[PDB]
Design a protein around this ligand. Structure first.
Ligand SMILES: Cc1cc2nc3c(=O)[nH]c(=O)nc-3n(C[C@H](O)[C@H](O)[C@H](O)COP(=O)(O)O)c2cc1C
Ligand SMILES: CCOC(=O)C1=C(Nc2ccc3ccccc3c2)OCC1=O
Ligand SMILES: O=C(O)c1cc(=O)[nH]c(=O)[nH]1
Length: 361
């Protein structure tokens, strides 16, 4: 409840009526590298503690993948009140991505469509940007216990999918609290291979040497699915996940099956925000049922209010990543939504958050 937030959250709602997305985004990215973005320091409520396997998130709210792709402000994004951030996605060979502009935001429908094309400075340049932080992380107080994952994918023209990840782990795997595979860009057996492929490198890091991360342990393997699949395709996947014994999924990414949005009729790419919430709260409640409550799930897909966030948990999401929230509601988005959830896990008579995971039977 600062003047600082509120002041920025005028500047920004201005941006969201007059400036391009990317431009606003790349501007506000810049400040936070020069550390002029307001902090959220006030201690969280332990009752909204949460974890996946052995991965402890001081609060449930992170910044989703593709927000800080190049990991250039990790600092001042986590010091807005997010437990964790997800950086990348990052390809072994860094890309300028599709031609601009490629990020378009709806202000009424609070929705975003992008054809970015995985623009990143490349696994090499990024790893160095993360390391420089893991250093900063020991010195600075306000980054103790804050989890950084890394999203990884394949180059556009890839020699082999697996070997593009393989380079990526090898480079960065030491400094991530989790690795995020994504197969969700705008069969099951080829997936199984990848997963196994990915665990193997992470199992090779441990043998050929260490963990300069926040856990100081080997990074968990999460896959980031997309909501545009059939039951058949889905259940065929779920089995792989249990077969791969996988550390967790990140339901979901950007849908492409939304054409009710006027401003976006002339655009191509995947949509994130309000119109993708519902779709993604049903995509947790299916991939929960099939894996039979055995795989931990990180929600992403139209989370804005503490209610929006609770709907994901009670579906089965042990954690919440925000992206569109920040675009629309702003820098208070952590402080506001966190306040909102505590006042809602109460209302509902949840003793703690972890009690409320998957309480849709
Ligand atoms: C402009 C833009 C870039 C994105 N880049 C990535 C990315 O590199 N890797 C990734 O895994 N997800 C990426 N996403 C997807 C988000 O991480 C998130 O899953 C999606 O936006 C849903 O969040 P929301 O509906 O809560 O905004 C991107 C989304 C947008 C709008
Ligand atoms: C590309 C995502 O959407 C934007 O461009 C956009 C945007 N994104 C960001 C990016 C980084 C941020 C860092 C800190 C606080 C808010 C932020 C908000 O804030 C206003 C706006 O228009
Ligand atoms: O960079 C992109 O095009 C991109 C990557 C991703 O994972 N999700 C998305 O919506 N866009």
């Amino acid at each position: 409840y600062n003047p600082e937030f509120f002041l920025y959250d005028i500047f920004l709602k201005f941006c969201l009526k007059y400036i391009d997305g990317e431009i606003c985004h790349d501007l506000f990215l810049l400040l936070g590298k020069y550390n002029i973005l307001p902090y959220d320091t006030s201690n969280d409520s332990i009752y909204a503690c949460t974890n996946i396997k052995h991965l402890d998130f001081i609060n449930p709210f992170g910044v989703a993948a593709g927000f800080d792709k190049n990991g250039v402000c990790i600092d001042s994004i986590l010091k807005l009140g997010f437990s964790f951030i997800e950086i990348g996605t990052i390809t072994p060979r860094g890309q300028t991505g599709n031609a601009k502009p490629r990020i378009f935001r709806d202000v009424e429908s609070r929705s975003i469509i992008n054809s970015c094309g995985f623009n990143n400075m490349g696994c090499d340049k990024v790893t160095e940007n993360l390391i420089l932080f893991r250093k900063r992380q020991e010195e600075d107080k306000l980054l103790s216990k804050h989890i950084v994952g890394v999203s990884i994918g394949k180059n556009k023209d890839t020699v082999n999918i697996v070997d593009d990840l393989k380079y990526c782990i090898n480079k960065i795997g030491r400094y991530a609290d989790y690795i995020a595979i994504n197969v969700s860009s705008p069969e099951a057996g080829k997936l199984k291979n990848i997963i196994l492929s990915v665990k193997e490198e992470i199992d090779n890091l441990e043998k050929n040497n260490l963990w300069f991360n926040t856990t100081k342990k080997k990074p968990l393997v999460f896959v980031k699915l997309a909501p545009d699949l059939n039951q058949e395709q889905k259940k065929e996947i779920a089995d792989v996940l249990l077969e791969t014994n996988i550390d967790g999924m990140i339901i979901s990414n950007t849908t492409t099956q939304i054409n009710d949005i006027k401003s976006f009729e002339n655009k191509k790419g995947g949509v994130s925000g309000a119109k993708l919430k519902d779709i993604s709260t049903k995509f947790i409640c299916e991939m929960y049922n099939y894996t039979n409550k055995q795989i931990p799930i990180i929600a992403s897909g139209g989370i804005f209010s503490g209610l929006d966030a609770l709907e994901k948990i009670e579906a089965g999401a042990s954690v919440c990543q925000l992206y569109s929230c920040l675009v629309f509601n702003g820098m208070k988005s952590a402080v506001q939504i966190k306040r909102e959830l505590n006042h809602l896990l109460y209302q509902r008579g949840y003793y703690n958050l972890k009690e409320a995971i998957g309480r849709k039977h």
